[PDB]
């Protein structure tokens with residue numbers, strides 16, 4: 001928000017306004033990075049981004065400590081080298097390359113379509129990067145009629161998403177990605193769980209309106225009483241939440257689930273790609289921005 005608005009005070013004392021991305025701006029498959037870029041906490045054009053830029057942006061404007069993004073930074077730069085063909089040093093070329101499929105970007109996302117979702121031909125691909133309202137609605141419908149959801153609910157959501165993706169993706173494309181997705185499940189609990197409840201650290205409950213605002217608008221739900229977590233969330237919270245999601249009991253099992261879908265997931269680790277492997281072509285779509293309604297500087 002505008003620095004003088006005081007909307008972030010006293011959790012964020014140095015805010016910048018929301019600015020919608022233009023047609024030439026680079027955006028990510030990540031709702032967090034997109035929100036940061038929309039506010040210029042990382043470059044608004046989504047290009048040439050250093051580790052420290054990202055660390056400071058997450059810590060000072062989102063209440064997310066350095067520990068939370070340590071692996072994410074490692075993987076971002078691995079994907080950058082893979083996509084571009086050369087070492088990206090400490091300048092991430094752009095955000096768009098992060099939508100390289102079967103890498104950091106993965107299938108059965110909460111709010112994005114899959115790279116080969118519903119395509120009639122093997123070589124075809126679609127926008128697996130921009131926010132997709134229809135996809136996100138499939139996630140929200142699992143918790144329809146609710147204001148909050150827990151670990152068990154999140155587990156049901158990711159299962160529903162896995163089921164839908166396995167059915168809709170071109171035969172052979174679907175690849176389960178529990179370790180990455182459920183770090184991201186942990187991310188959701190870290191950012192938009194209801195810290196106003198007395199037991200937030202034992203059984204954090206996500207506020208659905210906060211989640212919906214963040215994802216749909218790619219800006220921060222301050223108007224709904226949200227603020228950056230204080231103290232900043234640490235990696236321990238995230239991986240514990242991740243483990244708790246996958247450990248939660250399933251009361252409704254979707255069909256067409258991949259093998260081993262229900263149960264614990266592997267620890268997320270650094271990505272690696274063969275030097276001979278050519279990257280998949282990136283979707284070229286203009287960056288998404290909210291239009292119903294469009295957002296003002298303080299939204």
Ligand code: HEM
Nearest residue numbers: 029030032069072076098104105106109110111112184187
């Ligand atoms: C530099 C650090 C980060 C990088 C490089 C990064 C990168 C990515 C990428 C490539 C995806 C796409 C995966 C997919 O859904 O197919 C993604 C998704 C996601 N990111 Fe990040 N991320 C970072 C930090 C964060 C943080 C700190 C949060 C929140 C605390 C966050 C929230 C999310 C969520 C919730 C998704 C899932 C979106 C969905 O499934 O629709 N990210 N991120």
Ligand SMILES: *[C@@H]1O[C@H](CO)[C@@H](O[C@@H]2O[C@H](CO)[C@@H](O[C@@H]3O[C@H](CO)[C@@H](O)[C@H](O)[C@@H]3O)[C@H](O)[C@H]2NC(C)=O)[C@H](O)[C@H]1NC(C)=O
Nearest residue numbers: 024025026027083084093094095096097279280281282283
């Ligand atoms: C973000 O950065 C990535 C990585 O540099 C960009 O993707 C790449 O964009 C270039 C065009 O600037 C593509 O190069 C072209 O390749 C085709 C086919 O090989 C060739 O006919 C052209 O002569 C040109 O060399 C490249 O394919 C593409 N990489 C991938 C894997 O898709 C991306 O455009 C950037 N996005 C934004 C919004 O800045």
Ligand SMILES: *[C@@H]1O[C@H](CO)[C@@H](O[C@@H]2O[C@H](CO)[C@@H](O)[C@H](O)[C@H]2NC(C)=O)[C@H](O)[C@H]1NC(C)=O
Nearest residue numbers: 209212213214216217223224290293295296299
């Ligand atoms: C995206 O952001 C917009 C702008 O903040 C939200 O629309 C506002 O919703 C709040 C509810 O707290 C109201 O006070 C305002 O009257 C709304 N403004 C306008 C112009 O509609 C919108 O709800 C957000 N989207 C989601 C899905 O959360």
Ligand SMILES: *[C@H]1O[C@H](CO)[C@@H](O)[C@H](O)[C@@H]1O[C@H]1O[C@H](CO)[C@@H](O)[C@H](O)[C@@H]1O
Nearest residue numbers: 023024125126127282283284285286287
């Ligand atoms: C991205 O651009 C490519 C051409 O540069 C196309 O081959 C792709 O289909 C894709 O096009 C989509 O996004 C662009 C924005 O760059 C739009 O102009 C197209 O209408 C399409 O949605």
Ligand SMILES: *[C@@H]1O[C@H](CO)[C@@H](O)[C@H](O)[C@H]1NC(C)=O
Nearest residue numbers: 009010011012013014060230
């Ligand atoms: C914001 O400023 C107030 C008043 O000086 C201060 O008490 C608070 O600690 C500041 N917040 C942060 C996160 O620095």
Ligand SMILES: *[C@H]1O[C@H](CO)[C@@H](O)[C@H](O)[C@@H]1O
Nearest residue numbers: 179182183242243265266
């Ligand atoms: C989130 O983190 C937990 C603990 O590392 C994993 O078990 C899960 O697969 C996901 O990566």
Ligand SMILES: *[C@H]1O[C@H](CO)[C@@H](O)[C@H](O)[C@@H]1O
Nearest residue numbers: 235236237238239240267
């Ligand atoms: C989440 O998981 C990690 C290991 O993946 C632990 O280090 C952390 O304490 C938390 O249990």
Ligand SMILES: *[C@H]1O[C@H](CO)[C@@H](O)[C@H](O)[C@@H]1O
Nearest residue numbers: 201202203204237240241
């Ligand atoms: C790890 O941390 C999470 C979040 O604080 C808890 O919900 C979980 O029970 C475990 O202690």
Ligand SMILES: *[C@H]1O[C@H](CO)[C@@H](O)[C@H](O)[C@@H]1O
Nearest residue numbers: 239240241242243244247
């Ligand atoms: C990962 O961590 C969670 C929360 O502590 C457990 O529920 C799970 O069994 C696994 O150890």
Ligand SMILES: *[C@H]1O[C@H](CO)[C@@H](O)[C@H](O)[C@@H]1O
Nearest residue numbers: 152247248249250251252
């Ligand atoms: C986890 O617990 C539920 C009860 O809520 C059962 O339905 C399920 O079989 C599993 O034991």
Ligand SMILES: *[C@H]1O[C@H](CO)[C@@H](O)[C@H](O)[C@@H]1O
Nearest residue numbers: 142152153156250251252
């Ligand atoms: C068991 O409970 C879950 C909530 O965790 C529901 O999603 C499901 O429909 C069933 O009632």
Ligand SMILES: *[C@H]1O[C@H](CO)[C@@H](O)[C@H](O)[C@@H]1O
Nearest residue numbers: 249250251252253254262
């Ligand atoms: C749906 O069915 C699976 C087994 O296929 C269970 O693990 C789950 O608890 C739910 O009842």
Ligand SMILES: *[C@H]1O[C@H](CO)[C@@H](O)[C@H](O)[C@@H]1O
Nearest residue numbers: 142156160252253254255
């Ligand atoms: C229970 O919930 C699962 C996942 O949301 C559905 O796939 C199933 O149809 C039932 O409603």
Ligand SMILES: *[C@H]1O[C@H](CO)[C@@H](O)[C@H](O)[C@@H]1O
Nearest residue numbers: 270271272273274275276
């Ligand atoms: C990481 O691991 C892969 C193997 O999957 C190698 O191809 C790469 O060179 C790096 O060592």
Ligand SMILES: *[C@H]1O[C@H](CO)[C@@H](O)[C@H](O)[C@@H]1O
Nearest residue numbers: 290291293294295296297
């Ligand atoms: C987004 O842009 C529209 C104009 O199309 C405005 O009505 C709105 O206030 C927001 O700035």
Ligand SMILES: [Mn+2]
Nearest residue numbers: 105106107109
């Ligand atoms: Mn995805």
